[PDB]
């Protein structure tokens, strides 16, 4: 298999590369491109050696970078696809791969319409003369806000996340559709969140405690919003749900070059000190008020049945 | 489609040698790794698939190493070619060798086989090619390195530089390597013809990552007495033009010494070189399988950490590293093939393959090499080295600096042990 | 207390008329912003001829005629109390002065400069900390900078194509330092003894770097004298078709008298066919009927008549001729 | 003849009391290089005070106090005239020049109230030159006893209140927190001090470079990664700018943030203050007395795109970075004042410690 | 308070009346003829609407020594609701009507009025098997207020202790 090897090393070479471009939409479509092609690559006389194939592939691209994990649970969703198709031949060879292709095509059909469904879910919660607060962005976040602003009025106030800043990108991106934002420093939240009344963040991946590792600075603002008891809303889809558990693994917070957080121009100061900073935070699952999935609002602990009948929970070997 | 590069691995820094004798420069690890694979992963980060590694000496060691690399596999993308010749004794000799051999096409990259960096040159490489193609084909070189401290520990007193630059073209007005000096003079063929505002900067450091084209190849067919990059760039300054490129993001430097080797190893473990981090384990084996933890510490396979044996800051450990109890280690690297007694304190030390150490060996600031033994109560002092099966017994409170290895005339032992002859 | 400032009587009055005797020009521009307590140190018979000046104050101090420039300081030291914003002769005053003196206030150094639009001064990339200098003639040695002064500052800027302004924002401890060390004159070259890095007053030395131009200092400087600074109020003619000029009070302005970047002085009899200048024309003039001009500063008691001829040559005082063809070299006129 | 001052760009409606002011204009574009009213050393040290190098509260108070020292070191009251009321009638327009040069940080308000207290105390039929001499003696003994004797007493309490084997974080910046930490370090104690800062400033590089020149290990990060440090630290110190009447530590940008996330993982807080750093008026929360620094300073040096560069062309766009903010009283545990380890809500007892009653 | 503070600014006061029998509507009609655009609501709708309040006063009648306050009824549930939204609590009582007395040192400082105002006397046959009682005065702990305001200025919840001890000879607890 010539194409499979070069495409998986291109995938892991942009995985060890890091950020750029945006998020797991393009990374998701790269994963399903890999997975689509690796059922159309090489023959099999049973499903078991195919499991050896895709298990070796999943363990290598997972041990590439366990920072982001949508690669893993898209492998797990094609694992539940192959399991429900390995059942309904005995429930040996022919109809399988076609079923895999069409099922992942309907996976595409769902995941393309995710942000439009969040836009359809948008006009239920917020209303006029209000305020709202965010930390960074995925594109789902400003999709939610700009579609909410397409008919209604509010006044958003935004502290970024900045070991390195990217909340300014959303700040300007919905400065120019007429929203009246304020961009905030990443510390004066507590001065103003007493006056804010709703708060909505968008994470990057949410896990099997019903919990969430998000962008930096989310745990602090989340505990702050609990202190005023104002509800904090995760706008993450049904697409990031991952069977990891926080301290089972090895440091899901992991780290970058601190020239991100230090100018190199200070002198002889830096030799003794061992500075460090993570990419993520950790928020305990008691603290999210309400998801916004594609299908509708769901409980903060609606999670284990989602995994028992939205995955193959025996295949937590990954 | 311009993608070309070339590597060199020859130096002769005879200040703090004989470490370059049987484990030479070209297989000097950091933690059971290859520094040439650090350069090689950096030239994967370039985007170039074609490179040409230059052997200096012990070519069969390169033959065994690159037959078990990532790039021995012909399925791999970034192909590595090699030169096979042991007759050559400088920097630019093999350069004009490969250029009279003339299998070098265009606008390539030369770099030395020590450099660890993570700057993608494709925001500055195509900028160099823009300056080449749109302007007269005369700006032939752009050396590139990093904005730095006014005094940094990885810029040591033997390689420090200072550069006068343009206001905004970033072309070199003056360069001078200034070891063995205290004050700074300036040539004056660059001052009234540069009527634009002169920028003199003291905060940079020289690292040999020269992107260049084979017009440079002809410029050292011109002067046969040229040997290094230093007289290239100083033969630029006699009148076919050069810029620099400073950046604000990464860390790229080299070592031929041991001192800024210790500095760059301190830079690796507290991770001033992310994305390139030694726990992604980019070279391919399970003999480097270590995770993360608190305080940027790493634990490999068959760990066996001792009861109460605290292990606080910025270290790792490899394979077969039996650890005893009640030890205390900070800001250092223990590699594979390790055994530890008790109270075996290490500090900024280096324990490569096969090493042993007895209990109570209170040792600070070492540099130590293959399959070495050291007995009880060896108190040892900073800025020294041990290499290649040393045996030192009890109650040696060894002084500050003592190069101790198999060679009589320069190293301060003989082919027997290092206490006494 | 800050309020002391004076023009130097020499540069390094009688002749250099840009449009006025030149010392009239910086005094109204220092009196522009305050300084109701100010001195005008003279040095000679030019001390009590200031009825045209309409002062709130003056302190007209005469001095010896043969001197340097620190001799003024050692002469004037029994009358000053505070900060000295000393000025000089051959300087433009065409820029904001408030920001340099409040920079002296702002960044707690003892001094400040104007360095605004063969010379190499060292300023930081912050652009307010000057370091050292180099020039066209004295620095025949190449140029050498010291280790620690360039090791404490990592990058530096060399403003090159730029003139000195002879400005000094200095306070009292340097002037009684000069009373102690009375050896070194030439305030333009007392700044190589600056000693940022090494004591009778942890010490700092700064400067300030709109960007218009300055005058050449040999004798004339009238290339800056053609200045259309912000012609005002006089007895006029409304018959001369001329713009970018100054009218003449108590003078004979009429028709056929054009002044393209020139002026009309006092008793300037320009009512016949006078010509456009691109030059200067002072008082007591009668120049028309083809009194052409190019590069020709026409001083007081001016006369060029009956198809006069002049091009690329200045004039002076005591000229009385009709056909004196001034050649394209600036000749004795 | 009357000083004025304008505002800069878009402004938040919630801050009708305190405006925004940009750091990029002169303060002599309305009054000359002299001023018959305002004093040259006053505009000297006030323009020192405005640009933002005179940053610490103790440092800005001693700067204002030596400015007032230079004021009453030479000021000749003309005769047939009263001393005290004319001195306050001249010096409080000077206070107006101060608060319009840069707004109040009320420790200096306590200082000028102390100055009123002293000028109305010494009479007017008293000969006035030695009254000036004893007045300048009074104010400088006042300021040295307050500053350095409070620093020495707080260091004296601090010798015992740091354990061994522990660590500590600091936030904010002052000279006293540096004196506390190095005068805790150099006596045989062994503790590493992580230092945490914020943006747009990263002020505490000051405290970090002082602390590493005191030779103490460290690690440095920002309060939007303060969720990572709460497993490790065993006690948390804070600085303080001002002390509000119900025990609210009016303080630096992210102080109450760190207090909340401190006892969100239950590691007890500890602040530091002093005598004259107590006001009279009282408030509920942030939106009354809180300055704004520069807006445009929010910037990252990443690529070619400053992501708030074109700020001025937008009009339906706002921004805030509040710096000088408050804390609820029942999460700040106690202060270290010179009077001792005294708990939070017990602070305003010092209002009638005056008449021995 | 509101008559002074509405004359130069603009705000939006909402008021739930103190109704065993109502008199907060008399407050409403009293202040509404200066026009601050105020609203009234029922006493059991306060909890949801304090997601959109940001501060709350309580006009009490009797404040005691221990920092707690002995106000009209309904103030305890509103105090606990404002606790569970963390908006600040201010009590606008002067120093005048401070008491030195103590809560359960006093044998039921509550006073009930006739339950005619809760169960009206058109009740039919239901009455003689059901107890019915309503206080005018409730008790809400010192833990929950934050900001006094007084004649001399604002004070802490704990700082009324010194106000007692200096404003009252501390053994006249026996009246």
Defining traits:
part of a larger assembly, 5 chains, A: 318 residues, mainly alpha, Rossmann fold, three-stranded parallel beta sheet, 11 helices, globular, B: 421 residues, alpha/beta, Spore Coat Polysaccharide Biosynthesis Protein SpsA, Chain A, five-stranded mixed beta sheet, three-stranded antiparallel beta sheet, translation, Translation Initiation, Translation initiation factor eIF-2B subunit beta, Translation initiation factor eIF-2B subunit epsilon, Translation initiation factor eIF-2B subunit gamma
Walk me through what this model shows.
- The structure is cut from a larger assembly and holds two copies of chain A, one copy of chain B (421 residues), one copy of chain C (333 residues) and one copy of chain D (357 residues).
- Chain A is mostly helical.
- Chain A has a domain at 119-309: 3-Layer(aba) Sandwich (Rossmann fold).
- Chain A has helices spanning 2-15, 24-37, 48-64, 70-87, 96-112, 114-122, 139-148, 167-173, 189-192, 218-227, 304-308, and strands at 132-135, 156-159, 182-184, 199-201, 205-207, 212-213, 232-234, 241-242, 290-291.
- In chain A, the strands form three sheets. Chain A has a three-stranded parallel beta sheet, covered by helices on one side.
- Chain A is globular, with a radius of gyration of 21 Å.
- The two termini of chain A are 24 Å apart.
- Chain B has a domain at 4-258: Spore Coat Polysaccharide Biosynthesis Protein SpsA, Chain A (Alpha-Beta Complex).
- Chain B has seven helices and 22 strands.
- Chain C is largely without helices or strands.
- Chain C has a domain at 4-230: Spore Coat Polysaccharide Biosynthesis Protein SpsA, Chain A (Alpha-Beta Complex).
- Helix content of chain C is 11%, strand content 8%.
- Chain C contains five helices and nine strands, in the order αββαβαββββααββ.
- With 357 residues, chain D is α/β, with parallel strands linked by helices.
- Chain D has two domains: 1-153, no CATH class; 154-356, no CATH class.
- Chain D has helices spanning 40-51, 57-74, 84-101, 107-119, 128-158, 175-185, 205-213, 255-263, and strands spanning 168-170, 193-197, 220-222, 236-237, 242-244, 248-250, 269-272, 318-320, 334-337, 340-343.
- In chain D, helix 2 packs antiparallel against helix 5 and helix 5 (128-158) packs across helix 6 (175-185).
- Chain D is globular and about 70 Å long.
- The chains are: A mainly alpha (318), B alpha/beta (421), C little secondary structure (333), D alpha/beta (357).
- Chains in contact: A-B, A-D, A-E, B-C, C-D, D-E.
- Strand 3 of chain A pairs parallel with strand 8 of chain D.
- It is classed as translation.
- The entry lists the keywords Translation Initiation, translation.
- EIF2(aP) - eIF2B complex.
- Chains A, E: Translation initiation factor eIF-2B subunit beta.
- Organism of A, E: Homo sapiens.
């Amino acid at each position: 298999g010539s194409e499979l090897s070069e495409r998986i090393e291109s995938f892991v070479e942009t995985l060890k590369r890091g950020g750029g471009p945006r998020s797991s939409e393009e990374m998701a479509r790269e994963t399903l491109g890999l997975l689509r092609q690796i059922i159309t690559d090489h023959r099999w006389s049973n499903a078991g050696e195919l499991m050896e194939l895709i298990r070796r592939e999943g363990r290598r691209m997972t041990a590439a970078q366990p920072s982001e994990t949508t690669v893993g649970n898209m492998v797990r969703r094609v694992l539940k696809i192959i399991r429900e198709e390995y059942g309904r031949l005995h429930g040996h060879y022919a109809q399988l791969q076609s079923n895999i292709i069409e099922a992942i095509n309907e996976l595409l059909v769902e995941l393309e319409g995710t942000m439009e469904n969040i836009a359809a879910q948008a006009l239920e919660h917020i209303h006029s003369n209000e305020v709202i607060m965010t930390i960074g962005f995925s594109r789902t976040v400003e999709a939610f806000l700009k579609e909410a602003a397409r008919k209604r009025k509010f006044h958003v106030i935004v502290a970024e996340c900045a070991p390195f800043c990217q909340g300014h990108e959303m700040a300007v991106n919905l400065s120019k559709a007429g929203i009246e934002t304020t961009v905030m420093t990443d510390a004066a939240i507590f001065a103003v969140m007493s006056r804010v009344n709703k708060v909505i963040i968008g994470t990057k991946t949410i896990l099997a405690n019903g919990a969430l590792r998000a962008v930096t600075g989310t745990h602090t603002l989340a505990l702050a919003a609990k202190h005023h008891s104002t509800p904090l809303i995760v706008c993450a889809p049904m697409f990031k749900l991952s069977p990891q558990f926080p301290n089972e693994e090895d440091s899901f917070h992991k780290f970058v070059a601190p020239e991100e957080v230090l100018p190199f121009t200070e002198g002889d100061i830096l030799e003794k000190v061992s500075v460090h900073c993570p990419v993520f935070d950790y928020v305990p699952p008691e603290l999210i008020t309400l998801f916004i999935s594609n299908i509708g609002g769901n409980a903060p602990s609606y999670i284990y049945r989602l995994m028992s009948e939205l995955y193959h929970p025996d295949d937590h070997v990954l | 489609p311009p993608l070309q590069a070339v590597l060199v691995a020859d130096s002769f820094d005879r200040r703090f040698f004989p470490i370059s004798k049987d484990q030479p420069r070209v297989l000097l690890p950091l933690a059971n790794v290859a520094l040439i694979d650090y350069t090689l992963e950096f030239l994967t980060a370039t985007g170039v698939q074609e490179t040409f590694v230059f052997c200096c000496w012990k070519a069969a060691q390169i033959k065994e190493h690159l037959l078990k690399s990532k790039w021995c596999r012909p399925t791999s993308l970034n192909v590595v070619r090699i030169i096979t010749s042991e007759l050559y004794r400088s920097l630019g000799d093999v350069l004009r060798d490969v250029d009279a051999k003339a299998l070098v096409r265009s606008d390539f990259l030369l770099v030395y086989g020590d450099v660890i960096s993570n700057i993608n040159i494709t925001r500055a490489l195509e900028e160099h090619r823009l300056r080449r193609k749109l302007e007269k084909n005369v700006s032939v070189m752009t050396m590139i390195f990093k904005e730095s401290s006014p005094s940094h520990p990885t810029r040591c007193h033997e390689d420090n530089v200072v550069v006068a630059v343009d206001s905004t073209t970033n072309r070199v007005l003056h360069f001078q390597k200034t070891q063995g000096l205290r004050r700074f003079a300036f040539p004056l063929s660059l001052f009234q013809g540069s009527s634009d505002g002169v920028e003199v900067r003291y905060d940079l450091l020289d690292c040999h990552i020269s992107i260049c084209s084979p017009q440079v190849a002809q410029l050292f067919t011109d002067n046969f007495d040229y040997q290094t990059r230093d007289d290239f760039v100083r033969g630029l300054l006699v009148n076919n033009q050069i810029h620099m490129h400073v950046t604000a993001k990464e860390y790229g430097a080299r070592v031929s010494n041991l001192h800024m080797y210790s500095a760059v190893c301190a830079d690796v473990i507290r991770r001033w070189v992310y994305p390139l981090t030694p726990e992604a384990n980019f070279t391919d084996s399970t003999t480097q399988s270590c995770t993360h933890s608190r305080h940027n510490i790493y634990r490999g396979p068959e760990v066996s950490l001792g009861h109460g044996s605290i292990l606080e800051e910025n270290v790792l450990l490899g394979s077969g590293t039996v650890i005893g109890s009640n030890c205390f280690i900070t800001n250092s690297v223990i590699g594979p093939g390790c055994h530890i007694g008790d109270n075996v304190v290490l500090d900024q030390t280096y324990l490569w393959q096969g090493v042993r150490v007895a209990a109570g060996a209170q040792i600070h600031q070492s540099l130590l090499c293959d399959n070495a033994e050291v007995k009880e109560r060896v108190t040892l002092k900073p800025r020294s080295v041990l290499t290649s099966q040393v045996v030192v017994g009890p109650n040696i409170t060894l002084p500050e600096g003592s190069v101790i290895s198999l060679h009589p005339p320069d190293a301060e032992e003989d082919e027997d042990d290092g206490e006494f002859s | 207390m800050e309020f002391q400032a004076v023009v130097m009587a020499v540069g390094g009055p009688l002749l250099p008329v840009g449009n006025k005797p030149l010392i009239w020009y910086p005094l109204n521009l220092l009196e522009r912003v305050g300084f109701e307590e100010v001195i005008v140190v003279t040095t000679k018979a030019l001390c009590a001829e200031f009825k045209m000046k309409m002062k709130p104050d003056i302190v007209c101090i005469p001095d010896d005629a043969d001197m340097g420039t620190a001799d003024s300081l050692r002469y004037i030291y029994p009358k000053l109390k505070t900060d000295v914003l000393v000025l000089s002769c051959d300087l433009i005053t065409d820029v904001a002065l408030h920001e340099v003196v409040d920079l002296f206030r702002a960044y707690d150094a003892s001094l400040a400069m104007l360095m605004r639009k063969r010379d190499f001064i060292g300023v930081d990339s912050t652009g307010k900390r000057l370091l050292f200098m180099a020039n066209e003639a004295d620095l025949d040695e190449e140029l050498v900078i010291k280790g620690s002064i360039l090791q404490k500052h990592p990058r530096i800027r060399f403003h090159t194509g730029l003139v000195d302004a002879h400005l000094y924002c200095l306070k009292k401890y340097i002037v009684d330092f000069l009373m102690e060390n009375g050896s070194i004159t030439s305030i333009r070259s007392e700044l190589i003894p600056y000693l940022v890095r090494k004591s009778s007053q942890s010490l700092d030395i700064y400067s300030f770097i709109t960007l218009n131009l300055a005058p050449y200092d040999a004798c004339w400087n009238a290339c800056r004298g053609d200045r259309w600074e912000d012609s005002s109020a006089q007895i006029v003619s409304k018959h001369l078709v001329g713009v970018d000029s100054l009218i003449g009070p108590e003078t004979q302005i009429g028709e056929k008298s054009s002044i393209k970047r020139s002026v009309i002085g006092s008793s300037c009899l320009i009512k016949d066919r006078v010509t456009i200048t691109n030059c200067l024309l002072m008082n007591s003039v009668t120049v028309e009927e083809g009194s052409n001009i190019q590069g020709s500063v026409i001083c007081n008691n001016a006369v060029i008549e009956k198809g006069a001829d002049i091009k690329d040559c200045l004039i002076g005082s005591g000229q009385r001729i009709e056909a004196k063809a001034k050649r394209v070299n600036e000749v004795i006129v | 003849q009357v000083p004025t001052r304008k505002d800069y760009g878009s402004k938040v409606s919630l801050f009708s009391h305190l405006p925004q002011y940009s750091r990029q204009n002169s303060l002599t574009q309305f009054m000359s290089i002299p001023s018959s009213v305002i004093h040259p050393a006053m505009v000297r040290l006030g323009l020192q005070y405005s640009q933002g190098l005179v940053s610490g509260s103790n440092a800005r108070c001693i700067a204002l106090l030596r400015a007032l020292q230079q004021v009453i070191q030479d000021y000749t009251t003309p005769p047939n005239e009263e001393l005290s009321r004319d001195l306050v009638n001249k010096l409080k327009p000077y206070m107006s020049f101060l608060t319009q040069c840069r707004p109040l940080s009320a420790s200096m308000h306590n200082a000028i109230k102390f100055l009123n207290k002293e000028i109305t105390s010494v009479g007017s039929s008293k000969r006035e030159e030695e009254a000036k001499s004893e007045l300048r003696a009074a104010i400088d003994r006042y300021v040295q006893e307050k500053i350095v004797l409070a620093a020495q007493a707080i260091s004296r309490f601090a010798y015992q209140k740091i354990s061994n084997g522990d660590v500590i974080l600091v936030y904010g910046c002052s000279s006293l927190v540096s004196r506390i930490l190095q005068e805790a370090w150099t006596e045989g104690r062994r503790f590493r001090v992580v230092v945490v800062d914020s943006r747009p400033w990263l002020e505490g590089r000051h405290t970090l470079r002082s602390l590493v020149h005191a030779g103490v290990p460290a690690s440095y990060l920002l309060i939007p990664a303060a969720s990572y440090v709460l497993p490790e630290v065993s006690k948390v110190l804070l600085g303080a700018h001002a002390l509000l009447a119900n025990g609210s530590v009016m303080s630096r940008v992210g102080t109450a943030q760190l207090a909340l996330v401190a006892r969100a993982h239950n590691v007890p807080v500890l602040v530091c203050c002093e005598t004259y750093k107590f006001c009279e008026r009282v408030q509920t929360d942030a939106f009354v007395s809180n300055e704004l620094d520069d807006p445009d300073d929010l910037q990252c040096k990443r690529g070619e795109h400053v992501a708030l560069a074109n700020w001025q062309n937008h009009a339906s766009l706002r921004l805030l970075n509040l710096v000088y903010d408050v804390t609820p009283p029942e999460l700040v545990d106690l202060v270290i004042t010179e009077l001792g380890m005294i708990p939070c809500s017990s602070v305003p007892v010092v209002l009638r410690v005056k008449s021995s009653d």
